[PDB]
Design a protein around this ligand. Structure first.
Ligand SMILES: CCCCCCCCCCCCCCCCCC(=O)OC[C@H](COP(=O)([O-])OCC(O)COP(=O)([O-])OC[C@@H](COC(=O)CCCCCCCCCCCCCCCCC)OC(=O)CCCCCCCCCCCCCCCCC)OC(=O)CCCCCCCCCCCCCCCCC
Ligand SMILES: CCCCCCCCCCCCCCCCCC(=O)OC[C@H](COP(=O)([O-])OCC(O)COP(=O)([O-])OC[C@@H](COC(=O)CCCCCCCCCCCCCCCCC)OC(=O)CCCCCCCCCCCCCCCCC)OC(=O)CCCCCCCCCCCCCCCCC
Ligand code: BCL
Ligand code: BCL
Ligand code: BCL
Ligand code: BCL
Ligand SMILES: CC[C@H]1c2cc3[nH]c4c(c3C)C(=O)[C@H](C(=O)OC)c4c3nc(cc4[nH]c(cc(n2)[C@@H]1C)c(C(C)=O)c4C)[C@@H](C)[C@@H]3CCC(=O)OC/C=C(/C)CCC[C@H](C)CCC[C@H](C)CCCC(C)C
Ligand SMILES: CC[C@H]1c2cc3[nH]c4c(c3C)C(=O)[C@H](C(=O)OC)c4c3nc(cc4[nH]c(cc(n2)[C@@H]1C)c(C(C)=O)c4C)[C@@H](C)[C@@H]3CCC(=O)OC/C=C(/C)CCC[C@H](C)CCC[C@H](C)CCCC(C)C
Ligand SMILES: COC(C)(C)C/C=C/C(C)=C/C=C/C(C)=C/C=C/C(C)=C/C=C\C=C(C)\C=C\C=C(C)\C=C\C=C(C)\C=C\CC(C)(C)OC
Ligand SMILES: [Fe+3]
Ligand SMILES: [Mg+2]
Lengths: 318, 46, 46, 47, 278, 45, 274, 46, 46, 46, 46, 46, 45, 47
């Protein structure tokens, strides 16, 4: 019977926080900020205010146009039926151009809407990167969050823009839909011979699994050391308390080595961005310098060989 | 029209314009390359 | 109307108009490029 | 407002307009050369 | 093997790009490992750990980097690892004796480990000046001096369903053995994270009604029966919880003193907690 | 550090085990070669 | 050798078993009784894996300890026909369980909560789902995945395609979402801490007020320093838990193509429209 | 050689040796069970 | 060569030697078991 | 141009250049290997 | 060129040079092994 | 050249060298075992 | 921070190691060229 | 030991060079034995 530090029991509500004052060139923040009891159980209860700047507003405008174009094409695909839109919600999409158009501009209803939606969505994420970059600089912080986001954009641009351009056709890019973009993910692996054999896909999984592993470790460690005020990590970095000592000692005694309170966030930071960086690189390599990842794996001696269990099929057209 | 720079930071406007010019120039040059007529490196005939 | 600037902030309104028109100008030019009759680079018969 | 006086704002505005005009002047000559190479306004029958 | 991407009869671009990342990843792991060694290094190799019978400093692989300088907002520069935190750790004389003379043997505390600071009761050397917020206010402060704070995130929840939005002021504090140590008389809040950090309580059940003591919120089980249960320590052991130097302020050093004491009860509160199941 | 005597004491302890370990290893390899030599000729084993 | 602040923490007690007999450190590692058990299980499993490598191939990627055939059912197989995989599986389960029990002793010795062993138990639960629970429900140990770096990737591929489109698995969709969300949360949390404590050169180290302000400026909400670690553990553990759910329902509780599972959505009377 | 015990704690070497002997005995017995000739319970013929 | 133990700690070298030789001794024995001519348990013709 | 070295740390610039030179030299060498004409180890005939 | 050691830390450079040259030497030997004309182990005709 | 043992800790250099020597020897022996000409326990003819 | 005398001593042992390494590398390349020249002719090797 | 004197550094180096030479000499003897078994430098035609 002990407090498990899962939900906050006792809460205190002060005045709503306007935030750290910005330089006298940024737009005023919004004036709407409230407190939610439900969100205070997990963490900070205050919702709002939000900053709306030049890049923030422009990113929303590009993002809305992208979402409207995708949504209207989805709704038109089911003959404007809201009932069929709900029924087919996971299946509808905005389809990329067919392969015949290459990298040229296709007609609106033959991949043109996809290219416009992709362009405006790319602009919105690029402007959102600048928005995240400027907010960190305005408060005098480092731009680590912005560059972590830029790593995510790299995979977003590699999958949807850079790799299709290298392949010479917009058709290879991914449709704007839920199940259709899962179909693209599977068809990508089928087309290029089991993307499991892509080494950068393996590495991207290493850091994806390692990110969940690291946050499970770090999240549990901080919650386990929450008795000693471990969640106050800034103070524990500039002034090492016993929580940082116990957290470091917990993992040292467990697996022989440990990080610091600051350095575990570097580990988590790099694991998250390496997942997305290696993923983007692996997508760029396939189709461009590797045709069949399994045959590439056989060429490098990594494909296992299985003993006979059945009578092998022989290609009748071979 | 000189009162703009009283209202707006001259530096932040310049980055805004440069980013707009860089993005627009790249997009226009890319669109021309996609065409079968203005693709100068492809050397297509009219 | 000159009184519009006592309700709306002129500094913010000018920025909103410029980024707003940038999105609209890009969208319309792209739509015309994605049509047969008005793609001036493709030069299809009208 | 920003930390610029009238003279600073007017000094920036003159250079901004000169830089814009020179940038536009180069861009116009670039488009004149481009039009001489291949016009981008097709006729009713196309190119 | 022919086609685009081929570099030799066997090497191809996707293979060399992979080895380029292996080199980058190895360098990154070295960098990350060096960042791991900015606290606690070089290692103190005590006399019993070496055949030369003299204390030594061990760097390890990779060796610790150059010291890091943090610029603080108040106008100070602190070099990490801090000199005084290391100096304190290597100069104090522990009130504990190793169970066996060889290296790796656990320490057996001689006196009261909860007040001496051994094991789970240990505290770090921290600054004795109470922290301040960015605005300049006192960071951790009780509700009496921080009147802008009210207990309960939602008034309606705290009013009509007070079980899930409790106000623990006036509750009773129970030790790990059910001893009624005292009664909560105040809540200390962090102006930076907007959270209750401690529950101030009198010691009326085991001492005087005017003696104030801080109970960390993470060591307190605030029940639905107007009770706060402290599984960490015995009700009588509340009398030895470290006291505040100033009645209205708490320093980072004091925070470690208090959380260290309650953490000492994980092993030392009652006999048998330090013993195995079988 | 350690003295000459302690260093010599350790090396005497090390020399005992090294001789026995190398002696068994040498005898083991002589038996192993007598069983099946592991250096193939031009035609193999 | 020890960290310069480690001495005052290396105390006696907190063990679950073994007590004073195994309560000591070897270098930085705490041993305990479960450390001896986890070392015995780890070496035994690894050496058995290396022996299985010797009988097939020493190529690091091509080493494969495959489970027995489904024809053996739940029976223990001969050593070279899946029995070695079964022995290594119980060694790995023993190694993993003793590892978490060792962390519980270390948690108690340091006065920390048992969050880390419990979070690791979710990973153990996912592994036990793959090699025990799902094989048990389907009735044969041969449904487990082979112990090989590249061979178990082929197992994942074929098992995923046994349902013709594993992306349409609803529990798999949820588990992937948690996996993607936790690395997004990790990048945000890792970056935010680094941004505050390593600001633009010259500026001082920022406070917790800057952290809340930054994320409220970007997306309008900030979860706080305590909320993010609860959220990170929540997302990671749900990723672990729903991974076990997605694989446990694949074959014991769903034998058809996963896209066909969504036919219930397509036949909801509200939006049938036909 | 008796001076080895002035360097290593008797208990820690006993745990180390017993763990090694336990692991080694299991591996060899298991390796023999893998081979048909020395699988005594398997009962293969020579 | 007793001067070696003034440089390298004898106690940690012995443990390093035993663990390292354990891995090597197992590794070489396993290498022979992989071969045809030196797997004494299989007993293939030489 | 010597004033550049007061703006930037000479060590930092040299490491940046040397890393740039190393990566670029590796890229060009491997670019030549990818080509049929300039692969020296492949021994192609022009 | 001994002023290179006031800008560069000699102790750090020597360790980095050895590791960097280890990487380069292993790479080039392995490049020759992946070729057919310079794999000395395989011994293909030249 | 003897100054190397003043700049560096001799213990860390010896471990660094022996780590390289052990790893390199393992790599080379394994590479030979992977070939057919130099795989001695494989016993392949020339 | 680091004086001129140490820089001379660092460069002296650096030059000595550089000369020995470069000397062996040159001989190794001459031997490698004597074995199989790596620069193809017009028709190949 | 970290701050070795010049005399101790010089004596460490002398043993270091002798140990390195003995290690190299054993390796060279090993390579002559290995070369006798199967030469590793093929001719123009190969092995
Ligand atoms: C091409 C494919 C990839 C395309 C990617 C495109 C998108 C790029 C996004 C990815 C970048 C993520 C990292 C960004 C980051 O670290 O931000 C910190 C930093 C924050 O800056 P700040 O807030 O102004 O600084 C505050 C203070 O300086 C205080 O700041 P601080 O102290 O926190 O920062 C110090 C930090 C400084 O960090 C950095 O400068 C970032 C490192 C730059 C390179 C990024 C590497 C990842 C790119 C791909 C890697 C794989 C390439 C392999 C190619 C083939 C495969 O220290 C480090 O250097 C950490 C990195 C250590 C790397 C060790 C590598 C050794 C190599 C050995 C090789 C041996 C052979 O961001 C930058 O410095 C931006 C520089 C440019 C970033 C890349 C663009
Ligand atoms: C890309 C993906 C694929 C690649 C992934 C990466 C590769 C696979 C994963 C491997 C990663 C971890 C590998 C190493 C594990 C940690 C071992 C260790 O201690 O390392 C310390 C080492 C740094 O050591 P240090 O703290 O600087 O030590 C300073 C002195 O050595 C201080 O000296 P000292 O006083 O500590 O000396 C201790 C000495 C003294 O020994 C004695 O005297 C024994 C006396 C007996 C009587 O020896 C010992 O006591 C330790 C021997 C082992 C004891 C085992 C006892 C078993 C009990 C139960 C534990 C079960 C586990 O850190 C590492 O090498 C590991 C971190 C790097 C990898 C991180 C993971 C990256 C993943 C990326 C993905
Ligand atoms: C049959 C399917 C194939 C397969 C086919 C592919 C393909 C194709 C890809 C992957 C990719 C990945 N695969 Mg895979 N993959 C397989 C099996 C697996 C298994 C498993 C256990 O079986 C796992 C764990 C993984 C995991 C992974 C990741 C390591 C990697 C995705 C990283 C990521 O976070 O992207 C998610 C994050 C992003 C895409 C970036 C997001 C950032 C942007 C900016 C978000 C913008 C949001 C936007 C503004 C929101 C509004 C938009 C509008 C509303 C529309 N794959 C099998 C072999 N896989 C990707 C990769 O990197 O390949 C190496 C990839 O392209
Ligand atoms: C009697 C009390 C103790 C005991 C007391 C002592 C004492 C005292 C000493 C030894 C020493 C040794 N003992 Mg003992 N020893 C005992 C009984 C044994 C038995 C037995 C079955 O009875 C064996 C086989 C051994 C074996 C050994 C050797 C490890 C060592 C002697 C060789 C040496 O000098 O290494 C020297 C070689 C090295 C140091 C090289 C280190 C190898 C590194 C780790 C690199 C290897 C890499 C490896 C190949 C990687 C594997 C590949 C992977 C895929 C990566 N001892 C009993 C249990 N023993 C001596 C010793 O350890 O000195 C150092 C020593 O002084
Ligand atoms: C045809 C292939 C199918 C597919 C078929 C499958 C199959 C089959 C499975 C998954 C599983 C998963 N898939 Mg899928 N999946 C596909 C495509 C994807 C894509 C993508 C981008 O397309 C993604 C992101 C995913 C993601 C996922 C995850 C939800 C899940 C893997 C995580 C997990 O299991 O945690 C669980 C983590 C563990 C089990 C790790 C256990 C940890 C243990 C306890 C500790 C080990 C310690 C170790 C031995 C120590 C080593 C020694 C030291 C290092 C020294 N899949 C495609 C469409 N997928 C798996 C799953 O959910 O099952 C649980 C699974 O079985
Ligand atoms: C007994 C004495 C020691 C020893 C003592 C020394 C001393 C003293 C020196 C060397 C140096 C070298 N030694 Mg040594 N060295 C030994 C025996 C060897 C053996 C061998 C088979 O026995 C080999 C192959 C080497 C190899 C090498 C090379 C790494 C280097 C050769 C000259 C040089 O500067 O490279 C020329 C090439 C370069 C300088 C650049 C190479 C680029 C590579 C690809 C990456 C390097 C990154 C670079 C260092 C980045 C610097 C950034 C800043 C540090 C931040 N040594 C023994 C073990 N050696 C010298 C050295 O390393 O100086 C730097 C040197 O001063
Ligand atoms: C390290 C790689 C991982 C990663 C990192 C990462 N992602 C990031 C970041 C980082 C570091 C950010 O800083 C950024 C962010 O904002 O995070 C909170 C972001 C982000 N990652 C996001 C998504 C995302 N990340 C993903 C993945 C990942 N992110 C990786 C796993 C994925 C996946 C798995 O596919 C997704 C979907 C966004 C939430 C955010 C970037 C936001 C953005 O680009 O915004 C602009 C885009 C638009 C489409 C505009 C939307 C506009 C709205 C629709 C307006 C709504 C109308 C109206 C204005 C509302 C009010 C209504 C009125 C009626 C009042
Ligand atoms: C559930 C949420 C995520 C999570 C959490 C998590 N993992 C954890 C923890 C936590 C909280 C720990 O505390 C614990 C730890 O100490 O981490 C450093 C750990 C850990 N997670 C690890 C790995 C790991 N986690 C993974 C996943 C995840 N871990 C989830 C995504 C994966 C995946 C997805 O593949 C791996 C590989 C270890 C680094 C560590 C636990 C190590 C351990 O128990 O080691 C014991 C000693 C050994 C040497 C193991 C020997 C085992 C056998 C005897 C032999 C091998 C058998 C095995 C079946 C071989 C399989 C090979 C093939 C699959 C290639
Ligand atoms: C009717 O609906 C209303 C209007 C009511 C609102 C509803 C909206 C709805 C329901 C929207 C639903 C949206 C959904 C479900 C979207 C799903 C999106 C998914 C899952 C996307 C997943 C992957 C997509 C990717 C990765 C796309 C990548 C595309 C890229 C990167 C495109 C880049 C294109 C560029 C850069 C274009 C350049 C143009 C140039 C000029 C270069 O071309 C010449
Ligand atoms: Fe954190
Ligand atoms: Mg589709």
């Amino acid at each position: 019977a002990e407090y498990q530090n899962i939900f906050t029991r006792v809460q205190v509500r002060g005045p709503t926080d306007p935030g750290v004052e910005l330089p006298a060139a940024d737009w005023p923040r919004t004036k709407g900020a409230t407190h939610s009891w439900l969100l205070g159980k997990i963490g900070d209860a205050q919702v709002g205010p939000i900053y709306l700047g030049t890049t923030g507003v422009m990113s929303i405008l590009f993002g809305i146009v992208s979402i409207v174009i995708i949504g209207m094409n989805m709704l038109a695909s089911v003959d404007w039926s809201p009932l069929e839109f709900i029924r087919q919600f996971f299946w509808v999409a905005l389809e990329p151009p067919p392969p015949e158009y290459g990298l040229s501009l296709p007609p609106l209803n033959d991949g043109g809407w996809w290219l416009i939606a992709g362009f405006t969505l790319t602009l919105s994420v690029l402007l959102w990167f600048a928005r995240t970059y400027n907010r960190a600089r305005a408060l005098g912080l480092g731009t680590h969050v912005a560059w972590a986001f830029a790593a995510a954009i790299f995979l977003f641009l590699a999958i949807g823009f850079i790799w299709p351009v290298l392949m010479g056709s917009w058709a290879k890019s991914v449709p704007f839909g839920i199940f259709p973009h899962l179909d693209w993910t599977t068809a990508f692996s089928l087309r290029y011979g089991n993307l499991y054999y892509n080494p950068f896909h393996m590495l991207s999984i290493v850091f994806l699994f390692g990110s969940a592993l690291l946050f499970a470790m770090h999240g549990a460690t901080i919650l386990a050391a929450g008795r000693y005020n471990a969640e106050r990590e800034i103070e524990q970095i500039t002034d090492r308390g016993t929580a940082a000592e116990r957290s470091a000692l917990f993992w040292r005694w467990t697996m022989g080595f440990n990080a610091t309170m600051e350095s575990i966030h570097r580990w988590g930071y790099w694991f998250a961005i390496l997942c997305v960086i290696t993923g983007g690189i692996g997508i760029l390599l396939t189709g461009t310098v590797v045709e069949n990842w399994y045959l590439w794996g056989v060429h490098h001696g990594i494909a296992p060989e299985y003993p006979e269990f059945f009578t092998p099929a022989v290609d009748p057209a071979a | 029209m000189w009162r703009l720079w009283k209202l707006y930071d001259p530096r932040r406007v310049l980055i805004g314009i440069f980013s707009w010019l860089a993005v627009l120039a790249l997009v226009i040059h890319f669109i021309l390359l996609s065409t079968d007529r203005f693709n100068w490196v492809g050397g297509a005939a009219v | 109307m000159w009184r519009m600037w006592k309700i709306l902030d002129y500094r913010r309104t000018v920025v909103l108009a410029h980024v707003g028109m940038a999105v609209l100008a890009l969208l319309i030019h792209f739509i015309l490029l994605s049509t047969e009759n008005f793609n001036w680079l493709q030069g299809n018969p009208y | 407002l920003t930390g610029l006086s009238d003279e600073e704002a007017k000094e920036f505005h003159s250079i901004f307009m000169q830089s814009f005009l020179i940038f536009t002047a180069v861009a116009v000559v670039a488009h004149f050369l481009a039009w001489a190479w291949r016009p981008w306004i097709p006729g009713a029958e196309g190119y | 093997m022919e086609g685009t991407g081929a570099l030799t009869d066997y090497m191809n671009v996707a293979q060399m790009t992979l080895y380029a990342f292996w080199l980058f990843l190895a360098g990154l792991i070295v960098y990350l490992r060096m960042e791991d060694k900015r606290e606690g290094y070089p290692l103190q190799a005590e006399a019993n750990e070496n055949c030369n019978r003299t204390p030594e400093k061990k760097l390890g692989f990779p060796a610790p980097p150059s010291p890091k300088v943090f610029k603080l907002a108040d106008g100070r520069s602190i070099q990490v690892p801090r000199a005084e935190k290391t100096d304190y750790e290597l100069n104090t004389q522990l009130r504990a004796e190793p169970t066996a003379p060889w290296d790796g043997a656990p320490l057996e505390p001689t006196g009261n480990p909860m007040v001496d600071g051994l094991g789970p009761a240990a505290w770090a050397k921290r600054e004795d000046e109470p922290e301040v917020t960015h605005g300049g206010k006192q960071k951790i402060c009780p509700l009496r001096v921080a009147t802008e704070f009210e207990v309960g995130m939602s008034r309606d929840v705290a009013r009509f369903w007070p079980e899930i939005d409790p106000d623990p002021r006036g509750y009773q504090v129970l030790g790990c053995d059910g001893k009624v140590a005292g009664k909560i008389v105040d809540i200390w809040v962090d102006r930076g994270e907007l959270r209750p950090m401690y529950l101030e309580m009198d010691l009326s059940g085991v001492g005087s009604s005017g003696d104030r003591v801080l109970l960390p919120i993470n060591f307190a089980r605030v029940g639905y029966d107007s009770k706060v249960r402290v599984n960490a320590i015995t009700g009588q052991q509340f009398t030895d919880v470290p006291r505040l130097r100033e009645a209205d302020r708490i320093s980072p050093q004091e925070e470690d003193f208090i959380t260290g004491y309650f953490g000492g009860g994980v092993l030392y509160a009652v006999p048998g907690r330090t013993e195995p199941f079988l | 550090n350690v003295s000459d005597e302690e260093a010599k004491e350790f090396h005497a302890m090390f020399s005992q085990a090294f001789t026995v370990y190398i002696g068994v290893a040498v005898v083991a390899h002589i038996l192993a070669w007598a069983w099946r030599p592991w250096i193939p000729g031009d035609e193999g084993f | 050798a020890m960290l310069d602040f480690e001495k005052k923490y290396r105390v006696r007690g907190g063990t679950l078993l073994g007590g004073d007999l195994f309560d000591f450190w070897i270098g930085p590692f705490y041993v305990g009784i479960f450390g001896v058990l986890t070392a015995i299980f780890a070496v035994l499993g690894t050496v058995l894996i290396i022996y299985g490598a010797s009988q097939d191939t020493f190529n690091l990627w091509q080493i494969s300890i495959a489970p027995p055939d489904l024809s053996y059912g739940l029976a223990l197989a001969p050593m070279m026909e899946g029995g070695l995989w079964q022995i290594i599986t119980v060694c790995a389960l023993g190694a993993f369980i003793t590892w978490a029990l060792r962390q519980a002793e270390i948690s108690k010795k340091l006065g920390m909560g048992y969050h880390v062993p419990v979070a690791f138990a979710v990973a153990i639960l996912a592994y036990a789902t793959l090699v025990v629970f799902r094989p048990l429900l389907m009735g044969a140990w041969g449904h487990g995945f082979p112990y090989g770096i590249l061979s178990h990737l082929d197992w994942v591929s074929n098992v995923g395609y046994q349902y013709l489109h594993f992306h349409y698995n609803p529990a798999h969709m949820l588990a992937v979402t948690f996996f993607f969300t936790t690395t997004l949360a990790l990048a945000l949390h890792g970056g935010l801490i680094l941004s505050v404590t390593n600001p633009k050169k010259g500026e001082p180290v920022k406070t917790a007020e800057h952290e809340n302000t930054f994320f409220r400026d970007v997306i309008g909400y900030s979860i706080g320093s305590l909320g993010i670690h609860r959220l990170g553990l929540f997302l990671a553990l749900n990723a672990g838990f729903w991974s076990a759910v997605c694989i446990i329902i694949s074959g014991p509780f769903w034998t058809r193509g996963w896209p066909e599972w969504w036919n219930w959505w397509l036949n909801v009377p509200i939006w049938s429209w036909g």
